[PDB]
């Protein structure tokens, strides 16, 4: 069936770009739709980065577009966030979503990636 | 411009509904809609929605779980109720921006 | 069937139209093409199916 | 090998979708038709860079008026044979299904 | 046939050198309309490789500058579809000879 | 301001009978240096076009560029359309390939033609026909593109005059297909 993948480089050597790499498998990648960047702290609460779709509409935080990038990478057409800074003690989860538009159906959901920013 | 659940620890039982109380500040219904989703996660899984639009059947669910309400109320019945429900549920909008999490009442067993 | 000039030889050399341009596109619009894996590959004089 | 290619064997060549329009048409001009090539097929461009892309192919196909097919571009601007002669589609513009 | 009539351009008359002073003039007249409307003329960039940015003051204004033209009193001004509002014309016919011949003009 | 002729294919005036048209009692008014870089090009190729075309505009800042030519192809004017589009260059067509008509155009363009409207020489047409006092007239076309327009246009033209025009009969056949029914 339809399956996705997100990975990253997680944690190197300090003052680096983390660039997070989600691709999808087992279907088209730009057809219609959404894909969102979802960001959880450990205290069990959400909140929302980022969206872009094949129709190339995207939006974003006006206070968190300072240092996020959404890159392409066309072989398989996966998506790259890249972001300043990466550390280990503001351990938080990222996902990376496609979903039915109007950020109404959360159709597919993210397995979690560890990303810091401290 | 605050968006709450009630309550983090209520008392759930076997059998009877469980009321979920998502207060959301902003008026949710747009043209005769109200954009609710209902979903569940544990700490470190990955999400999956469990419910969408609060009266629309999900595949894979039967009707125990169901959405009630209007704009700045909205209310998570679970007819009846399982054991396995201990998780954390999240309710969140879907008129425009912002794009804001609910509270994420996590269900605890008795 | 034709006598053709084959396809010209880079951008460069020729001021000149291709003349199995026109046959060429005439044999195309006359080419009916049955293996349809999309369904009938049928299309009217416009250009499209 | 299904329609039989006895009297003419095929070579098949293909080129990226370039976002700079003026250098994807110069590649078109030097590298396809001078392996004197008898079709350009370009589908629409999944990346929303520009979406005009295939105007480029159209009209240095119609300078030589070979005839060039698309294979997902639906524009209806193309729809026109007095300026796109050599254009050809697969796939009908949104102009049809107002039939 | 002879006696068919058709129309074209004046390739007597409006001759490729008389075409060359028209445009000559058409553009000069843009240009001056277009510097003494908006005190100068922008400066587009030095690369076709650059990027799609379209100045403070975009070409949609000297496009309009290059709507409103007329040189030598010839309202050489072109509409919405950028045909010229008076273009010189002419009414060819097939003679005895099966040649072309000038029997009809149009002007203003 | 500054000028961009581009002469490919072309013998007929010379580059100093060129740059002589440059009068400078034409240049009385515009005090501004207007650089009237006239090129002959033994050759017209699409890729040495928009590289000359480039490094011109790179050197001299071109305002605008009449190109004229003897060639016979309308594929030119369409190229000089999407650079005009592209580049946010004008140019105008004059001579040869760009002589003919262009049906029509992208918006975004910033470009100028000579050649006129169908509708144009229809009025003159239709009006000249008038002059001879040919009122009896019957209308034929093929399926060439732009027909519904000059059909349309036409019509309309019948509709709204006081002469009285007599449409016996108008028809858009093809001669390509069935024979029999064209002659009938
Ligand atoms: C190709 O064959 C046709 C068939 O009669 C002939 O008329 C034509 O002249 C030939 N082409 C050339 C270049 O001679
Ligand atoms: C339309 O064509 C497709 C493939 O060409 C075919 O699968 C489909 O059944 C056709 N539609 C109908 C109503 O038969
Ligand atoms: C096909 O043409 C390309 C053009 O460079 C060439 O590299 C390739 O070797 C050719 N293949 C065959 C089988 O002729
Ligand atoms: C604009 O056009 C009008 C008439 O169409 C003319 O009188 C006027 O001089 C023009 N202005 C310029 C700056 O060319
Ligand atoms: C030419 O036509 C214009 C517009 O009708 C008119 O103003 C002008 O006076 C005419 N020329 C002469 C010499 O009368």
């Known amino acids: 069936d339809v399956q996705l993948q997100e990975s990253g480089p997680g944690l190197v050597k300090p003052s680096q770009s983390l660039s997070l790499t989600c691709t999808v498998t087992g279907y088209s990648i730009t057809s219609d739709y959404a894909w969102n960047w979802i960001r959880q702290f450990p205290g069990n609460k959400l909140e929302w980065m980022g969206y872009?779709?094949?129709?190339?509409?995207?939006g974003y935080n006006p206070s968190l577009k300072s240092r996020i990038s959404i890159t392409r990478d066309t072989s398989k057409n996966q998506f790259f966030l890249q972001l300043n800074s990466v550390t280990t003690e503001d351990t938080a989860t990222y996902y990376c979503a496609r979903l039915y538009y109007g950020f109404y159906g959360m159709d597919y959901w993210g397995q979690g990636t560890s990303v810091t920013v401290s | 411009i605050v968006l709450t659940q009630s309550p983090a620890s209520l008392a759930v039982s076997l059998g009877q509904r469980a009321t979920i109380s998502c207060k959301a500040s902003?008026?949710?219904?747009?043209?005769?809609?109200?954009?609710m989703n209902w979903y569940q996660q544990k700490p470190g899984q990955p999400p999956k929605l469990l419910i969408y639009?609060?009266?629309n059947l999900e595949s894979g669910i039967p009707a125990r779980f169901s959405g009630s309400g209007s704009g700045t109320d909205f209310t998570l019945n679970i007819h009846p109720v399982e054991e396995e429900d201990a998780a954390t549920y999240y309710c969140q909008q879907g008129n425009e921006d912002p794009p804001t999490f609910g509270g994420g009442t996590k269900l605890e067993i008795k | 069937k034709e006598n053709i000039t084959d396809p010209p030889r880079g951008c460069v050399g020729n001021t000149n139209i291709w003349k199995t341009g026109p046959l060429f596109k005439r044999v195309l619009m006359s080419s009916k093409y049955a293996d349809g894996v999309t369904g009938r590959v049928e299309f009217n004089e416009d250009g499209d199916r | 090998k299904r329609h039989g290619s006895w009297k003419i064997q095929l070579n098949a060549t293909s080129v990226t979708h370039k976002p700079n329009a003026i250098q994807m048409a110069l590649s078109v001009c030097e590298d396809l038709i001078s392996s004197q090539v008898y079709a350009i097929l370009v589908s629409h461009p999944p990346t929303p860079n520009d979406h005009f892309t295939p105007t480029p192919v159209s009209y240095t196909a119609g300078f030589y008026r070979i005839p060039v097919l698309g294979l997902t571009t639906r524009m209806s601007i193309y729809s026109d044979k007095s300026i796109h002669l050599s254009f050809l589609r697969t796939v009908p513009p949104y102009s049809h299904q107002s039939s | 046939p002879s006696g068919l009539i058709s129309v074209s351009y004046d390739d007597w008359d409006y001759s490729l050198e008389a075409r060359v002073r028209d445009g000559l003039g058409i553009l000069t007249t843009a240009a001056s309309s277009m510097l003494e409307k908006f005190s100068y003329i922008p400066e587009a960039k030095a690369s076709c490789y650059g990027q799609a940015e379209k100045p403070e003051t975009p070409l949609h204004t000297l496009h309009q500058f290059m709507v409103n033209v007329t040189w030598d009193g010839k309202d050489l001004s072109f509409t919405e579809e950028g045909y010229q509002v008076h273009p010189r014309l002419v009414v060819i016919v097939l003679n005895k000879d099966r040649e072309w011949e000038k029997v009809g003009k149009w002007e203003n | 301001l500054n000028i961009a002729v581009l002469l490919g294919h072309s013998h007929d005036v010379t580059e100093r009978e060129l740059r002589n048209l440059w009068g400078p009692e034409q240049a009385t008014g515009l005090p501004l240096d207007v650089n009237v870089v006239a090129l002959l090009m033994n050759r017209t190729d699409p890729k040495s076009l928009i590289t000359h075309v480039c490094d011109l505009m790179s050197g001299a800042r071109i305002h605008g560029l009449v190109f004229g030519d003897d060639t016979d192809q309308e594929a030119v004017a369409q190229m000089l359309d999407f650079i005009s589009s592209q580049t946010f260059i004008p140019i105008l067509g004059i001579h040869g390939g760009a002589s003919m008509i262009m049906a029509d155009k992208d918006p975004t363009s910033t470009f100028f033609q000579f050649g006129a409207s169908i509708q144009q020489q229809a009025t003159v047409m239709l009006k000249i026909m008038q002059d001879y006092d040919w009122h009896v007239f019957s209308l034929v076309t093929t399926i060439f593109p732009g027909y519904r327009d000059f059909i349309s246009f036409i019509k309309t033209t019948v509709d709204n005059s006081f002469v009285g025009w007599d449409m016996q009969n108008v028809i858009t056949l093809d001669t390509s297909f069935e024979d029999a029914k064209t002659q009938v």
């Open positions: 639009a609060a009266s």
């Open positions: 902003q008026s949710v219904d747009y043209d005769g809609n109200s954009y």
């Open positions: 872009i779709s094949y129709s190339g509409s995207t």
